[model samples]
Target: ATDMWLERAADVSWEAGAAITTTPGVYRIMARGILGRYQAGVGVMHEGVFHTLWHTTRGAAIMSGEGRLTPYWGNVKEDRVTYGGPWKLDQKWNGVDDVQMIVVEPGKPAINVQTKPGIFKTAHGEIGAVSLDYPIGTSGSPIVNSNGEIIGLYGNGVILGNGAYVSAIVQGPEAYNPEMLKKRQLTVLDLHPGAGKTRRILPQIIKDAIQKRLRTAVLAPTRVVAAEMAEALRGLPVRYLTPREHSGNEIVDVMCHATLTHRLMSPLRVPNYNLFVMDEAHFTDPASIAARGYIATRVEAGEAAAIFMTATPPGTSDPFPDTNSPVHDVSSEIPDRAWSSGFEWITDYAGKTVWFVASVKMSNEIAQCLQRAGKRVIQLNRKSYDTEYPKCKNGDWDFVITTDISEMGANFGASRVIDCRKSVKPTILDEGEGRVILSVPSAITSASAAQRRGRVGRNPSQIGDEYHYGGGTSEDDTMLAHWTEAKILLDNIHLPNGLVAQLYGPERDKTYTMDGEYRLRGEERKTFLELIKTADLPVWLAYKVASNGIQYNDRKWCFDGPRSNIILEDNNEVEKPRWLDARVYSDHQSLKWFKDFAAGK
Candidate 1:
């Protein structure tokens, strides 16, 4: 709406054939006739409109000519010269022998008067009658002595040898007759007056002429498409309210929606209501603050039932949390429990091959092997300052290697992910929340293994495509055992019940055949179970394991002995806790057992 007014002014001024100067001030144009025959006044135009009129003969011609006599009604007059009009002269005129006029316009051409004596040529190719001999304004000089006083006007240059002056003979009845000496004159009017009564009054007459013209000019029509659309939507039932407008107030919601739509579309004719719907709702920063204000007003008036819809809701965690009031989470009919089993089935059937390789040496080796296979490979190490990894063109290699930096805000179009770390960090899980993958963990703690597995089935591309593999090594076994212990400790701590189950499920009797041979003794299994069940580990110990915070093989789990002894003594107190007993198990065994448990049998 604001822009339309500006465009209208531009269009009008352009059509009027006036050169709008960049400077913002008043400009005056005086209309005068040839030989002082029509010298009336000067007109003052301001911002392309005539504000006042000044007549040389009249003091202030307020009611005369075509200008504003009163404040409201302005008088306008048509300009005598249209844009690009031809200039015509009444008669041919003469000057010094060598001076010739070049028609700049039809009659307003500049006359080339020679500064020095020389052979000259007229613009029309006529030869000079005589050579130029003197300067135009020199005194004590004349070409011909006439009736008494020196008569001929000095030409533009000096003669070389003669003491006699060389000058132009004034071509008239008397010496220097301006009327007879006139050349082809274009109607060039000089508006500035050297301070006289006429100069003072001239500006007003021009002003009146301009003002009169403005009154007759047609105004452009108003753009009302948006308003018309709003009117059309007045009777339709409101389908949804924007986030800010939805304050459980039906009336306020409708009004806010209508007002906002109208405001957005005011410049054009009424547009369809559906246009507003195309705007991205999720990216609305500050989360509909305007709508919130509208809601507040509506709520005060006892109006309610507004509903808001958006993709990225008001308080989503991105750069940071919204520090205003806590955002409400709208509950949906979806069930939370369905995720685990659903994920399991998805991992089992997803077509992509997945391997849970050990981090000790297997993960890096696997990545190198894939690279050597002519697949495009990307290695992302957060520890390194360089963010861009080398890409293999020609489809030679297609692999991304990252420590944990691949998680979170970073997005790559890679079809597969190779997680080289022991555990999937929250940051990584968040990034890989919806992606296809070939997940291979060298070694994983129980909680970490669960998170990594969860990453796969969260999206459809990862469904039924999970795989876990580890070479049978002492180091691998030790890591697996330690992972199991960590899981046991975590289960006994203050972890959420659902999280505990997700970390470790019901204990099932199983015999491990090593190298497809030896089976473990049942007594050995029972002893291991008892050790983990009776352990009373510190909260940090559980967190260290669950978060994969431990950095060295020498790092030990710090358990409270008295608590563990007491639990062990009281047979009734001990139950099958989900967390692993970190104190007694080998790190390799812990890591392997956790990985198997995470794979869900």
Candidate 2:
């Protein structure tokens, strides 16, 4: 016979929120199922109505004045969170039956589930784990940290041999402060119209939300963007909800899209955050509306505000569907670099040095090849960052290969990036010619090309320019600029010779002209390079410099992906690197050169 211990988790009501140790954030339920037994499913969070629904249809149960509470919530992924239990009511598991299971949850079931310094894996990545005498694991259970703070909501449970294994998904620390938010309600984030952008202070926003104790949630359209945002928040008190990443903190109170959107429908499954932020808020989803509405419903009552940031704002008929909801449209103009330049852009850059990509398998091969030719090389993958970050910051990394990860918050070290990632965009490296390493190829989407080019010019020490959208004030100075389409730029090119610019005046007069450092007020010289710069990087690089730039680096980047005989750019979102787009009959030197030089004929 098995003994079942019964306990009361926490007392909850139909209205208001909770604030205690055992059950600080539990809300009461009022879901009805015909006779009230089999009618519906309901959910609640720390202190607000999670959701109340029957089956298929979504309902609006919150209120402002006349049964009207604007709600907005979005879906989220599990990897970004740790699903565990703080204090679950009425639950027992056969998996945990081996251990002397103690009854807990609704009230004093037994000993406390103390937290640990050790971290564990999560849907998003890795994080801290907690320990307890008995694991009170259950879906929708509250998760408390050592400080007695309800850091997250439990998503699962298991009765392990040692004890009860449990987890809780962390929530974001930012929330709405309606009074302050009402001062400026409709928050619109406009990155402005172009490929250029500035890395603004989402960090400060995150910092403020955390110390102030405001409940908040951040929703991103893509996990990539979301993960980067979360990474930006590292060292802060909050936790990020990345599906395949991890943080140093144990209990997170922050989350994002794909990971968060899934949780919007359940009741008591969410924390009533003060602020709800959605990145790429266009392409509206029912859940986004619901989640935002949910937070705004509380905001409508008091103490909350919402933020919607996007490069483009959809807002057609109604920026704000509801009345009295004031909206603020904030835009930042980042003019990073010129979208167009003459062919001199490449000749100018390659003039100064050998190229280096910061992070990849190619990092070693390129660095080794450069060394053989007496070209100084420095590589900072994961092992060398602690040393390299400081060295690069001082700006001596002439020819360096580094990863985007090392560059994230690191100081401006390397300017000449030979973009190695498969997800490349049409980029404009402002390091002049010698500074930029690789030959920029025509990219598929404008977005892809822009990102890599965008990365290069941020380093101020390198050669660059400012496109003044606003006057040339402190705010006026910007590098961000919209780029012309690749197809359009290609159409304008008048290459007298083929892409093989190395032959006679063909290469020099057209592609590789020695314009030498363009100076004295605005490069009125060759803004034309922007047109010719598009398309795939050439397969055969020339000269001693060409041998250094290509050969080995090409062997890794341009070769051996699909199989040994062929070179592939590898798999990516936008496009894959296709070598010699024309297939060859004999993987060897099956070129026209062999036909032209056939001495026997």
Candidate 3:
């Protein structure tokens, strides 16, 4: 019923992996699963159900779409079969069991007159095999019979005129409906800095949420960033919650992390927003972490969906630790030369600039230096950011000095950024679509350094410059070790009456005093009053001790010992107790260095 001349010509292009000029006889399946969206494979329509390769649909939560071989081929809905193989026989069947089949692609259909079927071993377990001429790159194709009906699903194929096999053909109308799940739990975009996460991805997400009528909560690190998002996402049904009196209405769309945390933790009943967009996710402050956990719990319960975006995700899995969180690495998509660079720091920069510092005192010192040099500078920190940020945005300041508070969201439109520490940098690159340049400080992690360099040079037209400072050593080892130990501390802190009960118990059995001494309870109410005088310092000390403590020589409750040796009076005999040594947690080049410092040798 099909012409051999036309099909043979089309086979040449399909086998070459080029666009076919003919109509496709198959539907392409596009699947979006836990590992993000991807092209699954081609599917054959049978009784209104798409019978696709099973391996392609394994982790898929949402699957749909048609073949894209060509515009005309994509619209074809008929379950038409095409050419398959001129397979080399196993010699056992010979000419009696010869099967002529056709391999059908979206726009390219070709006929193979001699297909020899035989039992063969394959990666998808032992199944039916057909030897053909270079059957490579034909994965997930529907193998058809002479009656134009799908008989098998093509899986792995061999090259050099060897044999290829197929996975089991899906049977019955109950195969895969493809409409099972409508939502995803968490979507993570593990993109590089200046990857337009805020500029492009957020807008599309917001648009989708609005179209679906899903009440959404867009949470940022600070109000300045939240205000910027609100401005960028204006015209939609979004209400930005500023720190001022603007929350009488229960309906809201965008707010800072602290504001949302207050709403969820406070007594005031707020509306249920099922979709959460967490921006600048690397800022793992305590309040933000708590809010994230709450939202993640809801997401696990299927009550909400969330999006976590960052240039640097945590080393380990989080939020949905058990599930393989879908992450799309979009660093390669943007064309820029910042990803490839060396260490160079250029201080002679013109136009408005922003310098990232590690502390408030450093900001002040830098501002003083710039002022003495007759340069107009805007100084800001956590204390003065709410008031001073507007000046950096509007006024002509040569340098805007601040800490990590402004690192994540606030865009100063500065042409140059100077990072003074090895800590995390801003996700938003410099000067409107990243036309500015940046100076990178020695970073604690390669991820953090990449974030610094990512500030400039996003577009191909404006290839930004990057400078580096490589004087000091990286504290990545210390921070990573601390992070691992802190995770252990957080997981095992629930010891019933160990730490939590002692802090919040109504009837206390024993409690710590202000002078780092514990007294037996019920002996006197005066001692209980002394516990109140400490004012949560004892609990904080307990938390720190648990976090940084190390056990040695079967002696428990041993912390880093103090710099000086101290003996306390015990049983009228000379005795020494382990002291809390703050230096034990310091970043040293070697362990022997700490041992020598501790032994005072």
Best by lDDT: 3
Ranking by TM-score: 3, 2, 1
Candidate 3 regions exceeding 4 Å error are 1-183, 190-200, 244-252, 267-272, 316-347, 423-443, 458-460, 471-601
- Clash count, candidate 2: 114
lDDT per residue as tens, model 1, 1-601: 1000000111111111111121221122222334532213222222333322211212222232323232222222211111111211112222332222110111121122323233334343322233443222121122221111212222223344656443322212001111211122111112111132123322232233233321111000111222222333343222232221233322211223223422321233421111111111221111123222222223233322122222123222231121111112221121111122232322333223223333323436655655454444444443231434323223333444444322211223323322322532111111221111123433433323322222233333322322232221112222122223223322232211232211111111111212112111344323333332333223223333334333222223223233332223123442222233332232344435433433333
Candidate 1: global Cα-lDDT? 0.26
Candidate 3 structure lDDT = 0.44
Q: Tens digit of lDDT per residue, candidate 2, span 1-601?
A: 0111112334332212232242233322222344532211112333333321112113323321123332344233331211122222322221111111111233233222323323455555444333433322333334443233444443333355685564433343123333343422556564321222224446655666666666567676544455556656677666566553445543334555434533432222555566666665542232333344344444444545666654324322221121111222222231122223342332244322223232244566656655555555567654466566456545454555554333222233333334332311212233322111232221122222123233334433344321111111111111111111111122222222132111111111222222221111122112222111221222121111132333222334332233432322223121112123221211134233222222221
Candidate 2 weakest ten by summed lDDT = 468-477
TM-score of 2: 0.26
Tell me which of candidates 1 and 2 scores higher on TM-score. Answer: 2
User: What tens digits encode model 3's per-residue C-alpha lDDT throughout 1-601?
Assistant: 1101111111111122212222334544444447654444454444333344434434233222332221111111212222221111111222224343334433344433345566645444445566543332234455544444445555544343364333232222011111211244665555333435566657777777766767788888887777778666765566776553444443436778766654553335656667877887655454465455555555655766777666555442221111112211222121111222232222245666666665554566667766665678888776678788887657687877766566465655555556553442222122221211122433444444334434444433433433233323252333222222222222322222232112211111122223212322232222222222322112222333333333212223332334233322332322121433222222233223434433432
**TM-score for each model:** 0.17, 0.26, 0.43
Query: Residue 394's C-alpha lDDT in candidate 2?
Result: 55
RMSD of 2: 27.0
- Whole-model lDDT values for every prediction: 0.26, 0.34, 0.44
